[PDB]
Design a protein around this ligand. Structure first.
Ligand code: IJF
Ligand code: CL
Length: 130
């Protein structure tokens, strides 16, 4: 229905705003763009499902997210990719891991504070009906 299209629209507007707020945080700059093969030619080798905040915007705009749960799976991927690609005790890896945990924690905290649970539940029920 048009009401369901309106619901998904509101979801996309909400997800673009959360994503923008993460992307403008200087801590999260490394997560804003895909990894350039030049700097890191072994990246695409190790990480089978690369994800970054520019790709998340593109996915929102392509109507790939019908629930906040599905969006959070991609935020979780940005985090777990960074924990897997950068697992060493050296400070460069520890700094990326801490920034990746912080992204994930920040996205969850904004959603806890600003997503209405009944809005999510509605999205989940429209998705499950499709
Ligand atoms: O969980 C991430 C995701 C990817 C696609 Br494609 C659609 C929905 N959710
Ligand atoms: Cl830095």
């Amino acid at each position: 229905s048009m009401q369901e299209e309106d619901t998904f629209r509101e979801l996309r507007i909400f997800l673009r705003n959360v994503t923008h707020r993460l992307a403008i945080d200087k801590r999260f700059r490394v997560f804003t763009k895909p990894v350039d093969p030049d700097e890191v030619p072994d990246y695409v080798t190790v990480i089978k499902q690369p994800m970054d905040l520019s790709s998340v915007i593109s996915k929102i705009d392509l109507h790939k997210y019908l629930t906040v749960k599905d969006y959070l799976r991609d935020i979780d991927l940005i985090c777990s990719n960074a924990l897997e690609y950068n697992p060493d005790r050296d400070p460069g890896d520890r700094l990326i891991r801490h920034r990746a945990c912080a992204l994930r924690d920040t996205a969850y905290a904004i959603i806890k504070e600003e997503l209405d649970e009944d809005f999510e539940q509605l999205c989940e029920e429209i998705q499950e009906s499709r």
